[PDB]
Design a protein around this ligand. Sequence first.
Ligand SMILES: O=C([O-])C(=O)[O-]
Ligand SMILES: O=C([O-])C(=O)[O-]
Ligand SMILES: [K+]
Ligand SMILES: [K+]
Ligand SMILES: [Mg+2]
Ligand SMILES: [Mg+2]
Lengths: 504, 511, 506, 511
Amino acid sequence: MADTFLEHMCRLDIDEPPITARNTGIICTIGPASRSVETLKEMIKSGMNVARLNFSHGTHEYHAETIKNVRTATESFASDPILYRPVAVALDTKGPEIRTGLIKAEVELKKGATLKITLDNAYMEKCDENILWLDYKNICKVVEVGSKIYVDDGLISLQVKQKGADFLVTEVENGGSLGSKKGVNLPGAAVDLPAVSEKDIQDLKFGVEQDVDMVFASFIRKASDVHEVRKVLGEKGKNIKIISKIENHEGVRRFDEILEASDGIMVARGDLGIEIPAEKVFLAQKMMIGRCNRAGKPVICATQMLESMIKKPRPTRAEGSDVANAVLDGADCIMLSGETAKGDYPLEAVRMQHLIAREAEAAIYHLQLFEELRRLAPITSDPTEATAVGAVEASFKCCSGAIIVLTKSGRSAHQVARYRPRAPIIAVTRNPQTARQAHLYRGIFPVLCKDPVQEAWAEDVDLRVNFAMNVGKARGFFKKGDVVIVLTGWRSGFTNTMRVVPVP
Amino acid sequence: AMADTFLEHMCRLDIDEPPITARNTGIICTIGPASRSVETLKEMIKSGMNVARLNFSHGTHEYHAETIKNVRTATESFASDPILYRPVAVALDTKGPEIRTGLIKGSGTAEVELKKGATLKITLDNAYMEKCDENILWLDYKNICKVVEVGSKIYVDDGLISLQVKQKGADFLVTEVENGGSLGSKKGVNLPGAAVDLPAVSEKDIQDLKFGVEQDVDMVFASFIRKASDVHEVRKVLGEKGKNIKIISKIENHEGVRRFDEILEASDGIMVARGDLGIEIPAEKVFLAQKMMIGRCNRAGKPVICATQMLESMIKKPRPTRAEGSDVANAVLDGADCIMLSGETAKGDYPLEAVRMQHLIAREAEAAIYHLQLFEELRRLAPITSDPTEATAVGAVEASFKCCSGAIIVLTKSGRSAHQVARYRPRAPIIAVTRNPQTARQAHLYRGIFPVLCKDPVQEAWAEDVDLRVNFAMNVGKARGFFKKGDVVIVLTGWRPGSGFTNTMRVVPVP
Amino acid sequence: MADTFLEHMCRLDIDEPPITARNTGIICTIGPASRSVETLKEMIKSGMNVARLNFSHGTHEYHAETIKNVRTATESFASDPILYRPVAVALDTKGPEIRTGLIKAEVELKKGATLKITLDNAYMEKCDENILWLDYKNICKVVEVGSKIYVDDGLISLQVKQKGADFLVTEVENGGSLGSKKGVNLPGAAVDLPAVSEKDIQDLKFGVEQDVDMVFASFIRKASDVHEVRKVLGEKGKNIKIISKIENHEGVRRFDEILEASDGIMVARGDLGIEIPAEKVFLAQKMMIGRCNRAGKPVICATQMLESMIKKPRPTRAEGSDVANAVLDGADCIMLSGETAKGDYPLEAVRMQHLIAREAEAAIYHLQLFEELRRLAPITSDPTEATAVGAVEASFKCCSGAIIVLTKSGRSAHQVARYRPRAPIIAVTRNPQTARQAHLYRGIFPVLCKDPVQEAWAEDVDLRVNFAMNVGKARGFFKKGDVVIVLTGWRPGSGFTNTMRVVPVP
Amino acid sequence: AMADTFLEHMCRLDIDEPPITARNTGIICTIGPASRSVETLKEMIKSGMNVARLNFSHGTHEYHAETIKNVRTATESFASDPILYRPVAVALDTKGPEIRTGLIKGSGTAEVELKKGATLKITLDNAYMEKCDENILWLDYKNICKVVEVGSKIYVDDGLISLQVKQKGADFLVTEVENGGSLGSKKGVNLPGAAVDLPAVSEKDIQDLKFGVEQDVDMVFASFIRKASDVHEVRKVLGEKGKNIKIISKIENHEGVRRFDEILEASDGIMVARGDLGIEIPAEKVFLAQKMMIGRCNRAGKPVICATQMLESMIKKPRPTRAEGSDVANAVLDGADCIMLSGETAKGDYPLEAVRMQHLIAREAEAAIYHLQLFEELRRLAPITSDPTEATAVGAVEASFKCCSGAIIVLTKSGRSAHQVARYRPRAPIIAVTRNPQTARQAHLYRGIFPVLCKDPVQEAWAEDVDLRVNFAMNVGKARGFFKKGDVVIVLTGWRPGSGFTNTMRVVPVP
Ligand SMILES: O=C([O-])C(=O)[O-]
Ligand SMILES: O=C([O-])C(=O)[O-]
Ligand SMILES: [K+]
Ligand SMILES: [K+]
Ligand SMILES: [Mg+2]
Ligand SMILES: [Mg+2]
């Protein structure tokens, strides 16, 4: 509304409540703190849209049981289709990780002490303060004397003092408590591990068997890595979405070809901020969100967004700012990892991301955003593109309560979301996978129609539209006499009709 | 357009890029001796005329009834092909509170020379009303001595001759010529700064407006409007029988500019009547008033006409001056909905060349509009509304830009749906399909509306009817060269018959 | 101040007086109506800044006398250095003109009649309704059956029906009265003539001898044409400004290379509107003005701006609009031709351009114009460029009465003018030619300091700044207590303007 | 800032593009046990500390006098080389109307575990002020029972523990534990929504402020400012002797946000004190208040500080969390003049790494600012004035962008000329040359200002005095790597000594 971004900031009002709808999807990592069906039901009620399974840990049998619990909780609400919320399942691959071994349970590494790194498997369960095993058998080929090795989210740091043929002698730079099977980072080293290992192949086939909705591919460095994951999913998994995790320097450098090959991007800030200087992570995050926004592809901001809530019921002020600014940047989804997998306050963490995301969406400077997105998108002969941007423009003109989109594949609703309306996008589908995957796109509130198909086209259209009207009324997005925008076809790939209709 | 700044947009204008076929700006032609025959009117229509203006400053009711007959005979000679038929509107331009001189005396030369520094007596004695000459001039404003004083300036004939009042009398004035010149018969007089007390709607005006209602004219151009109550009185004369006739207030004096907002609110549209305006206010200020008025009409979504002397030299020459070509283009760049020809078509030697030149310039200028900025500004200065038709309109225009559509096709009964699209100034032509002949004629007032009159019978099933009128628009656009099979067009329709229900926008390929 | 151009337009107010200063230069063509010392004096008082001498007509002896009269009229005001106005002298070359012979007097040409065009010089003084001689001797090699030939301001038009050896048989398409020695246009034909004829070389050498300030080079088609003009003016004329007249299709197509080679541009709309379709001239006009504004080179809009005032004391409404829109477009100068060379109301024509230009300058949307000029202009290590744009920003911030610029060559003042401040740019120089050429630049009000040079540089700066203070007070540009911007150097000579000061008017 | 849109500007951010040497955002470090020794303060200064914050919520006048002495000793250890000397400001942060609990009892564990649903009695009986435990909790707000009601929430220890009042008494409250946790001694208590009637300026605060004046502090961070009259009270206490001390109002409750405008008018600057603010208002609204206040301070040209938990994890860890890296960067991108460290430097294990991290992030964020849009908007929202100083400042900032200058050099007495430059947010560092030590330290409050203290005697020739100080600035910039010989800088000077005469801008090559 204000004519400048500065005036817009000056008018932000803490006493102005936001609208009901929350447009940014929330991705929760499942683990011991959130694995029970009972807790999952509350997670869903608190706002979880996507359950993420971290395949860096756990057996297939452990993950099959998590998936089972997630679906039990999700389907416990299916008896009321107007209130049912689809919940997607994401498989986050291990990828080319480096891990330490088992502590012979922690030991205290002291700054200045010597610590020897061994590849001898006779020590893989006998790590202590003098000797440390790790599973990267080629480490001696890629690090030099003077190299830095980081352990456990980059908190422990070691300096290589001597390099043998199959061992390293290091000095502890930043010490502290060292546990078992901790992650290792070698920034600057040309780590030669494969993008898709044999474990990754087994995990990906398991995801197809288990009917997952998306894959979060760790440590993607180039387009050929994405093509490899895509080849493994094969024809049977061809509709599974591949989200490439950017988390090293090469992935940032090669981001454009990775984006073109991917269905979406995760800014995987944990590893990313150890691989590049921490003071540069915000630049990469904003670069990648902007480029994904410009391309109309989903982008996830992830890792440590509410980290202190693993142990505290309230977040720090930096965490509140970080969630809000991710939404203001343009992130389609935000994510929780330890805060929901292992923390003491998993439901409070979900509710806080819901609350902050909703406040941040109300603070977006839509006047400039809508202008620049349209200026940066080319002209096209696609009738669905023109109808989508026309519908969004109409939605700003009448401050509609929603844009209702009927969609089989999701494509129609994605095209609308790319132009970032303020109003929620109620995407009506009969395809359950479409409904689960639509959570990746900002603004899309998927609803799963279960009424049988009508033989007459016009009748089946009116049925799904009335379904959306009832969902919107039930959720409090709008009320009788409000005005909504409705996008339909006139005959998949034929969305070309916009109607401005009052809610009955 | 596409450059990120207006300055770069200017730098990229290319005389070698042809414009599109469609011409969006309406052309209003004043009919007179040079254009009155059915034959010539047929060529005027072919050349681009959209509205025939009848100037009631001259002519009897018999005379104007015959002009209207000939306009309609020429217009309906094209009706046998509904695809190519062009509606032609009829406009009545009132005389209003004009001041005119008398006739030059029989003896002597046809015109008298008023020489700088000479004395000239102005009389109201009717014994001189047909014996005007270089010593004594009669005029028909019987109260003129009451509203002028010594030192007052009096202008005669398009402001070209100027007098200064040296002595005031009971029923005369003694003046000194300042700007001399040749004086003919029955010339217009202006008293800038004087409080002229003639009514906005005279007894003659009432009879003319009542005549216009009976003859079924489409619009009235109301001369010398100074305030909203002037407009209301015109509206009251037109009454219930003429309630659908559009009132265009002519702004031609300082008070009309001063009270412009209330006049615009009461009016259906505005004419910037630059002839009288440039005499009532300093000539160097007219462009300011023009740009202010076009801007405010654009903001309000009401039609605005730029009028008078746009191609003046073409009264005697077959090509216009460079100033005239620039004037026509800048009126369109300003945002005028219509442009107008007066003497160029009513009396000049090249009426068809004048119409053709306005059609050519307007089309080039429309291609030069910086739509990127204009569309953004119109949206920002337009309020949010709970009106579904308004949301649909702006949504259709945005979609029209996104796919570079060949047209926006709008089914409309009253015209309103199409006018709401026109207010947002799409590049593409707006084909307004109506079965209402008056709607089709009045639609010429709005930039970009190309009205087509469907004469097919109403199909029993609404959906079938709609598709009939859409396909009619498709045939018209293909025939006029606006688009071809496989192009994308925008189509706006209602959800039920009647006015007020336009809520549906479709992006469809042309068959 | 409005946030949108649309709202800016809506707020234009006919009752708001403009400031006193008029920033757009007025160029007047001198001719029979305006040649006398007595009239030239009134032309200067009415606002004429540049006297244009059209070398399509007249002998060197005739033009030498014109120049003497201009300088007599101009120096008649030198008595008072604070009110003295410099007046430049412009030579407008004949160029590759095509002219008909002598009728030997006018004939009528009827539509549909036959007219024969001959190169036979026996008929050169025997033009009539049947036979017409023109001086372009290769015309048959460039025209084709069916081509259009335009005579006399494009008002008569002929279509070639038969093409011979030294002959053309035409049909009269647009008739009318035909006098002697009228101009011919062959739009679409690839005319062969030199851009610099031998007569042009003698005329340019004459201009150097007469100390003219600028050359208006007719029918410039390419950069090498401009190079050839520069070569002829030579070392002796190296400071004469060369303005290329764009008036054919080739000049528009090759505008960029011509602008780069030129000191400035004239949009010569008369010939241009016959060479290209009349409805396209406004596009060429705004293109060239925009490109000249972007390059920071002067651009003149010319021809038929107030044409009806050749015979009438007031202009038409389209002529009022044309002058104003030229200024709104961004033209640095506007020009009068027949209106002052030969018409009945030369002083009224000048006064009207002065009045319209001032009203138009007050209506410019400076908020957007200053934003876009900066965006399009490069980052530079040149200190005077940075100082100039800093001075313009400062002038907008404090709504200053003027920007005062001391300049030897003009360049420092030209750099300010490119950023288009609202405030007048008082350019103080001791170089009289600098003072005359500065009229080419929108906003520059040049003043000629005649005081001797003070031994102390610092005192000589203050003296020249105090001179501008007195000029601005006398002309009513500002009053004591107003704030102005002052631009100066740090050491004497050209190329050191790096100092901006905000100071009260004493 | 070169892309035509903010979105493309984002798309072009390049992690491999190194930033300029200069860091423009001031860093304020809270001093405490971790950072109080002279040896550590010297390393704090080298790491980037610009302002030392003394937290008067804790410690005696003796303690704070010694802190001030050590800060001055470390700062003046660099004074031998005036080219490299960095001024360091001293800030006094008042206790204000704090509410705190008592000491945990000596018996049992050091902290007591409060369990969800347990009963906890709050008492005002002083016999318990050092005997708090899991059943009884003393606090020091003797009027608490008069401002809370049954149902009210009471928060303890950074809002981490929450209690609901279930029963009221004359000197006690019975509460139920809502959010349990480990309770230590002398923790902060918040009563959001309650009408706490503690004075803005207690007698203790008055003694602290008077001690601040006597110890020559540079600025005061006034806690819990709710209204302009609170600010006027601080200013009156500082009095004539303290009239040059800058008052920074800390906004940390709902009423201070509500009355922000009148507070900002009365204050020299603002601190967004997010610690208490995020307990007094919902945590999810803090970012809205932060961005509003930063925007309104930027619009007003007054310094704004973003404070609290910016690098909180670094109290215990040598690297920050990803959210902490993003928070610091976004504070700078919002427009914060300074950023602050609290426990990170006052008591943490990694004070030097925390300072260095803020310096590294702020420098990267400053290179990412979209100056193209920022400079346009700051100019559009700023008034036209006859103030010649203000016109000179915006002109130098425009010139700095035009030639990509290495610095803007500003000679200033009071600092104001350099403040006026900083308000328009140049990319180039502002080297503010002053002989007033207090001006130099206070200049750290303003984004972009690099203060340097000239220790040369005044030259009798004004022109020679200017030149001496400008060349000092040249040598500073070369030593610090802000520019080299042949680079171009902007120089602002006045036309006579004293404040208010800045009116000269020069573009000069670096000698
Ligand atoms: O030569 C000229 O000035 C013209 O043709 O307009
Ligand atoms: O006082 C403070 O600094 C706070 O509460 O954030
Ligand atoms: K993983
Ligand atoms: K010439
Ligand atoms: Mg009139
Ligand atoms: Mg010419």
